[PDB]
Amino acid sequence: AVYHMTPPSGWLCDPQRPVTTHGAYQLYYLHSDQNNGPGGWDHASTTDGVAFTHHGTVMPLRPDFPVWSGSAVVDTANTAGFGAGAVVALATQPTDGVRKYQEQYLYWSTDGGFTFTALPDPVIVNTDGRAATTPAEIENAEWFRDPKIHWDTARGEWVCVIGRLRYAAFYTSPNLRDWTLRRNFDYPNHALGGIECPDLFEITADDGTRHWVLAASMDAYGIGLPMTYAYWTGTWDGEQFHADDLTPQWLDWGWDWYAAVTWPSIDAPETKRLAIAWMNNWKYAARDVPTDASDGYNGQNSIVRELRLARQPGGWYTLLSTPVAALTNYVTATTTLPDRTVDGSAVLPWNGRAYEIELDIAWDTATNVGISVGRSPDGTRHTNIGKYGADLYVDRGPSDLAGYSLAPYSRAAAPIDPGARSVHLRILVDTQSVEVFVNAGHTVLSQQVHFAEGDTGISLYTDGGPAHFTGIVVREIGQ
């Protein structure tokens, strides 16, 4: 991966909310020496959100006691008592290696998040886990993970969201040590997924309005929806969360954008947030990847994106995504290509593996229009990105690699007005991925793709009529 974070070695997993210390973002992420084996928290830092420096394990694996996802924050006011500015983190661990006993342990750092000390006793106990007898009780107790911390400015206290089976629990606290159970949050459609790696934050929209956002990673494949990150705008009164609408919105429509986490940006903390996710899916996450045998590692995170909340007609709010701005500093070359009209297909006189391409497509009668990325000269391999009916799709099927097929999860799709007769696309291509930002960023599709060394071409295609391809710009990304 040219411009995507990858662990120096081993198996990569869930990222954790980054903290802002020593003039940089300290990102933490789950790591294991074996693909999908026991693991802990590894530490990495970045000053621009694109390039990372790895620092190794921070919250280690221990005999029958892995460390799972949670969140970290900096206790600026020393409310916890571990020192002003201390970095505090809560992470789920299976006490005694028992699943139904999974609970929240607190770890802290007084060196800016580079070394942590563990707090022996869980700060939030899975009590019902001990009382679980029936298969149902046991299932419930076995889903009490991923605490996400947040400082409630209005109430002046800490609020914590924890993932549960098809619902989310909340706790308040004045010092990160003593928590008080609050009202759970339920949603009507359980075929949606059951709250894993929940997120909780406040953000100001473009109209100056303040809003709360509750989100989590889901798995709505069954009802034709994404297995990514869904969110509910609303409020937190300090005891319960009220969603403006019970049907959540989605942040990504591709296959690989799981366990996403968000954090405040330094230059505009309340207005602009950053986000990163694990470019993987559990349908195949555990399997072997090309990079396993060539560099002894499995997994990469997505490009870091910038988030902003925009008002919509009717007085409701939605998020917009865009590649982190700093990515532009890694552009080593800019190639523009003549506008052109194509009816059927055409190959572009350009080749590369790590770049960013932007373009506009306009058509009339054409029923299908698109661009093929990662095209091999033999013409057999390529990932297609185009517009069909009411779909802005990304099909990696023709890019399935022998011995590492992603089938049957090939065609991803985001909604787009069926009446649209033109679209703008910004596509990020790297050696093991393709990320698509459609138009102004309301829809994004992130997907892992096992490209072969020779998959370097780009081609244009249409069906049912000619299309006008304009504003073609290709910026190659280096390091």
Experimental method: X-ray
Q: How far apart are CA 198 and CA 208, in angstroms?
A: 25
Q: How far apart are CA 477 and CA 325, in angstroms?
A: 13
HSE of 70, CA atoms in CB hemisphere, 13 A: 27
Q: How far apart are CA 93 and CA 40, in angstroms?
A: 10
Tally of residues, the chain: 479
Q: Which of 144, 46, 38 is nearest to 90 (CA)?
A: 144
Q: Which of 63, 67, 58 is nearest to 105 (CA)?
A: 67
- Cβ atoms within 10 A of the Cβ of 340, count? 13
Q: How far apart are CA 437 and CA 441, in angstroms?
A: 6
Q: What is the resolution of this structure in A?
A: 2.6
Tokens of 369: 């229009």
CA 469 to chain centre: 30
Q: Are residues 296 and 336 in the same domain?
A: no
Contact 225/253 with Cβ under 8 angstroms?
Answer: no
Classify the C-alpha dihedral 255-256-260-265 as positive or negative.
negative
Q: Are residues 118 and 151 in the same domain?
A: yes
Contact 162/104 with Cβ under 8 angstroms?
Answer: yes
- Cβ atoms within 10 A of the Cβ of 452, count? 14
Amino acid (one-letter) located at 412: A
Q: Are residues 198 and 310 in the same domain?
A: yes
Contact 28/301 with Cβ under 8 angstroms?
Answer: no
Burial of 192 (0-12, 13-18, 19+ CB in 10 A): buried
Tokens 């590692």 found at: 297
Q: How far apart are CA 202 and CA 297, in angstroms?
A: 36
3-state secondary structure 272-291: CEEEEEECCCCCCCCCCCHH
Q: Are residues 292 and 345 in the same domain?
A: no
Tokens of 86: 């201390």
What is the b/e burial string over 387-399, where b = at least 16 CB atoms within 10 angstroms of the residue's CB? bbeebbbbbbebb
The alpha carbon torsion through 66, 70, 71, 77 (nearest 10 deg) reads -90
Q: How far apart are CA 221 and CA 166, in angstroms?
A: 15
Q: How far apart are CA 219 and CA 230, in angstroms?
A: 10
Pairing of strands 24-32, 457-463: unpaired
Q: How far apart are CA 260 and CA 272, in angstroms?
A: 16
Contact 273/263 with Cβ under 8 angstroms?
Answer: yes
Q: Are residues 115 and 221 in the same domain?
A: yes
Q: Are residues 285 and 184 in the same domain?
A: yes
- Cβ atoms within 10 A of the Cβ of 174, count? 13
Q: Are residues 288 and 437 in the same domain?
A: no
Q: Which of 59, 62, 64 is nearest to 30 (CA)?
A: 59
Domain containing residue 238: CATH number: 2.115.10.20
Residue that terminates a domain, selected from 326, 341, 369: 326
Classify the C-alpha dihedral 278-253-255-165 as positive or negative.
positive
Q: Which of 143, 148, 137, 256 is nearest to 198 (CA)?
A: 148
Q: Are residues 267 and 380 in the same domain?
A: no
Q: Are residues 255 and 332 in the same domain?
A: no
Classify the C-alpha dihedral 41-46-49-52 as positive or negative.
negative
In angstroms and rounded to an integer, the radius of gyration of the C-alpha atoms of the chain is 22
Tokens of 383: 């990932």
Tokens 């299309």 found at: 467
Classify the C-alpha dihedral 274-40-169-187 as positive or negative.
positive
3-state secondary structure the chain: CCCCCCCCCEEEEEEEEEEEECCEEEEEEEEECCCCCCEEEEEEEECCCCCCEEEEEEECCCCCCCCCCEEEEEECCCCCCCCCCEEEEEEEEEHHHCHHHEEEEEEEECCCCCCCEECCCCCECCCHHHHCCCHHHHHHHCCEEEEEEEEECCCCEEEEEEEECCEEEEEEECCCCCCEECCCECCCCHHHCCCEEEEEEEEECCCCCEEEEEEEECCCHHHCCCCCEEEEEEEECCCCEEECCCCCEECCCCCCCEEEEEEECCCCCCCCEEEEEECCCCCCCCCCCHHHHHHCEECCECCCEEEEEEEECCCEEEEEEEECHHHHHHEEEEEEECCEEECCEEEEEEECCCEEEEEEEEECCCCEEEEEEEECCCCCCCEEEEEECCEEEEECHHHCCCCCCCCCCCEEEEECCCCCCEEEEEEEEECCEEEEEECCCCEEEEEECCCCCCCCEEEEEEECCCEEEEEEEEEEECC
Q: Are residues 379 and 464 in the same domain?
A: yes
Q: What are phi and psi of 56, to 5 degrees?
A: 80, -170
Integer CA distances (angstroms), 157 to 144, 178, 248, 320, 420, in order:
22, 11, 27, 29, 47
Q: How far apart are the first and last CA of the chain?
A: 11
Q: How far apart are CA 38 and CA 36, in angstroms?
A: 7
HSE of 423, CA atoms in CB hemisphere, 13 A: 30
Q: Which of 344, 390, 347, 352 is nearest to 369 (CA)?
A: 344
Domain containing residue 400: CATH number: 2.60.120.560
Q: How far apart are CA 43 and CA 35, in angstroms?
A: 18
CA 397 to chain centre: 22
Pairing of strands 433-438, 345-351: unpaired
Q: Are residues 75 and 223 in the same domain?
A: yes
Sheet of 24-32, strand order? 53-59, 39-46, 24-32, 10-21, 297-298
Contact 426/446 with Cβ under 8 angstroms?
Answer: no
Residue that terminates a domain, selected from 259, 292, 326: 326
Tokens of 353: 């593996």
Residue that terminates a domain, selected from 294, 326, 358: 326
Q: What are phi and psi of 325, to 5 degrees?
A: -60, -35
Q: Are residues 179 and 68 in the same domain?
A: yes
CA 85 to chain centre: 27
Tokens 């790591």 found at: 31
**What angle is formed at CA 246 by the lines to CA 241 and CA 248, rounded to 5 degrees?**
100
Sequence-separated (6 or more) residues with CB below 8 Å from residue 247: 188, 189
Q: What are phi and psi of 317, to 5 degrees?
A: -130, 145
Classify the C-alpha dihedral 216-217-218-224 as positive or negative.
positive
Tokens of 201: 């934050």
Is 207 noted as a catalytic residue in this protein? Answer: no
- Total domains in the chain come to 2
Contact 371/442 with Cβ under 8 angstroms?
Answer: no
Catalytic residue among 14, 75, 219, 256: 14
Tokens of 7: 């662990």
Q: How far apart are CA 31 and CA 11, in angstroms?
A: 6
Sequence-separated (6 or more) residues with CB below 8 Å from residue 387: 361, 368, 369, 370, 393, 416, 420, 423
Q: Residue 67: give the domain boundaries.
A: 1-326
